C-alpha cells in the first residue's frame, strides 16, 4: 500500500502565526492528494483536493502545495477555529490511504503537571476489583508519559488512560490513568506508585501510597 508520512506529529502555534503540515508519500502520485480538517465529534472537513484546489467554503488562508511525493498544507493567518487535527489523503492508487494526522495546538508557556494518586476505595474492594487512579492535572505540552510500578515492578498491559480537550482558558491538558487489578493481586503487594515524565519536570516525579499504611 502507499504509505503517507505526516510531520510534525504535533504543531503548537498561537493565533496569527503561519503553520505548515507536510505529507510525504512512499511513491509518486501525480497530484492525487487531499487534506481534511477533523474536530471532536464532527465529520471530516475537506480543505484541499487535487493537491492544490481549495474547496468551496474554505477560507483563503488555507492553501495546498506539493507534487510527486512531497505535499504541504499551509495556514497563513492561523485562527482559533483552526485548532484541530489535519490528515492527508492519497487516491492515486487503490486503496485510499491517509496520514497519521497532525495535531494543531495552541502554544503557551511550558507548565508541568500536578500529580495525584488515588487508591482503591472501601466500596470497590468489597465488589471484587482494585482500581488505582493517577491524575496529571493542568499541564502543557500535551505529550506526557505515565508508568505504573507495584513493588517497583513495572506494570504493562493492565492500564488505561484518557486525555481531555485543550482547555480554552489555561490552554492546558489533564490526563487520567487507571490501573485495574484483581482484588487478589492487589492484596499481594504493598507499594503502588505512578511515575510521570514531562518536559516541564526536572526529573521523573513519583506519587505513591503504601497499601494499608495509616
Amino acid at each position: 500500500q502507499v504509505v503517507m508520512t505526516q510531520s510534525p506529529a504535533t504543531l503548537s502555534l498561537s493565533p496569527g502565526e503561519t503553520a505548515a503540515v507536510s505529507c510525504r508519500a512512499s511513491q509518486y502520485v501525480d497530484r492525487s492528494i487531499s487534506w481534511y480538517q477533523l474536530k471532536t465529534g464532527r465529520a471530516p472537513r475537506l480543505l484541499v483536493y487535487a493537491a492544490s484546489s481549495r474547496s468551496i467554503g474554505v477560507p483563503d488562508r488555507f492553501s495546498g502545495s506539493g507534487s510527486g511525493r512531497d505535499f504541504t498544507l499551509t495556514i497563513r493567518g492561523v485562527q482559533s477555529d483552526d485548532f484541530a487535527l489535519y490528515y492527508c489523503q492519497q487516491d492515486y492508487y487503490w486503496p485510499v490511504t491517509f496520514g497519521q494526522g497532525t495535531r494543531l495546538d495552541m502554544k503557551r508557556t511550558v507548565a508541568a503537571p500536578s500529580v495525584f494518586i488515588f487508591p482503591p476505595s472501601d466500596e470497590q474492594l468489597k465488589s471484587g476489583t482494585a482500581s488505582v487512579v493517577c491524575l496529571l492535572n493542568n499541564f502543557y505540552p500535551r505529550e506526557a508519559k505515565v508508568q505504573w510500578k507495584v513493588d517497583n515492578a513495572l506494570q504493562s498491559g493492565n492500564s488505561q488512560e484518557s486525555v481531555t480537550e485543550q482547555d480554552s482558558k489555561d490552554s492546558t491538558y489533564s490526563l487520567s490513568s487507571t490501573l485495574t487489578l484483581s482484588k487478589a493481586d492487589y492484596e499481594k503487594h504493598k507499594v503502588y506508585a505512578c511515575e510521570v515524565t514531562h518536559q516541564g519536570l526536572s526529573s521523573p516525579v513519583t506519587k505513591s501510597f503504601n497499601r494499608g499504611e495509616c
Binding site: 491517509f98 488515588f118 491524575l135 492535572n137 484518557s162 481531555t164
Partner: protein, 229 residues
C-alpha cells in the same frame, strides 16, 4: 442542498453483522460515487470501499473483501434521493469505530476526495447489555501530602452504553473540574473518571458530591467524597 444522513449509533456483539445505511439527498444520486471511511478513535482514518450508485458495483480494499458488502437503492420517482447501505460481518474488537459516509467532488468519480460527509455512525462491539454504573470515591490516601492544593473525584465504573453526565455539588462547584473521556475496557464495559482540584485546607471541611446520570440505564446517583483517617 446536499445532505447525507446515516444510521444512529449501533451496538453489536462479537461475530455479529452490522448494517449502516446512508441516505443521500440534494443532488443527482446516480452521478457520484459514495465512499465509506472508518474513524477508529486511537488510530486514524481507514478507507473501506466505494460503490457506483448507478450500476451498483462495489470496490473495496483488500482488508475487507469477503467481509463487507455495499448495496444501493435508487428511488422509484426521483433522481435526487438515494440510499447506500453497508454491511460488515463478524465484527470484532478491531471494528469499533465511527463509520462515515461521503461522496466525491464533482468530476472526481475516478478518485476519492470526499466533499460531503454524513454525521457519522458509531458502532461499538461489546459483549454486554445496558448496565448502570458503580460510582466510587477517589480521595488522597491516609498519609498523602499534597503541597498547596489537593484533589478528589468520582470513578464511574462498568457501564454501557455511553454516555454519562457528571456534575459536582449539583452545579455549584465548577472551577477546577476535569471530567475525562470514557475508556472502553476489555470487559466491553465503559469506565470514566471525574476529578476536581481543591485547596488542601478545604479537604475535610467542605461537602463535595458528584452527581452522575446514566440516562440509558435510568441510573441517577449522588456520592459524597471524603478523605479517611
Amino acid at each position: 442542498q446536499v445532505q447525507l444522513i446515516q444510521s444512529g449509533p449501533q451496538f453489536k456483539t462479537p461475530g455479529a453483522s452490522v448494517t449502516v445505511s446512508c441516505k443521500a439527498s440534494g443532488y443527482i444520486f446516480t452521478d457520484y460515487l459514495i465512499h465509506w471511511v472508518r474513524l477508529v478513535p486511537g488510530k486514524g482514518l481507514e478507507w473501506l470501499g466505494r460503490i457506483n450508485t448507478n450500476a451498483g458495483l462495489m470496490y473495496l480494499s483488500h482488508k475487507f473483501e469477503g467481509r463487507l458488502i455495499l448495496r444501493r437503492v435508487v428511488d422509484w420517482r426521483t433522481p435526487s434521493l438515494g440510499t447506500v447501505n453497508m454491511e460488515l460481518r463478524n465484527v470484532r474488537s478491531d471494528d469499533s469505530a465511527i463509520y462515515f459516509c461521503g461522496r466525491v467532488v464533482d468530476g472526481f468519480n475516478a478518485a476519492g476526495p470526499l466533499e460531503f460527509w454524513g454525521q457519522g455512525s458509531p458502532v461499538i462491539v461489546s459483549s454486554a447489555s445496558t448496565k448502570g454504573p458503580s460510582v466510587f470515591p477517589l480521595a488522597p490516601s491516609s498519609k498523602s501530602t499534597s503541597g498547596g492544593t489537593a484533589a478528589l473525584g468520582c470513578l464511574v465504573k462498568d457501564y454501557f452504553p455511553e454516555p454519562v453526565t457528571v456534575s459536582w455539588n449539583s452545579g455549584a462547584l465548577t472551577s477546577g473540574v476535569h471530567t475525562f473521556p470514557a475508556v472502553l475496557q476489555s470487559s466491553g464495559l465503559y469506565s470514566l473518571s471525574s476529578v476536581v482540584t481543591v485547596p488542601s485546607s478545604s479537604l475535610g471541611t467542605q461537602t463535595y458530591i458528584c452527581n452522575v446520570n446514566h440516562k440509558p440505564s435510568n441510573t441517577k446517583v449522588d456520592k459524597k467524597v471524603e478523605p479517611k483517617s
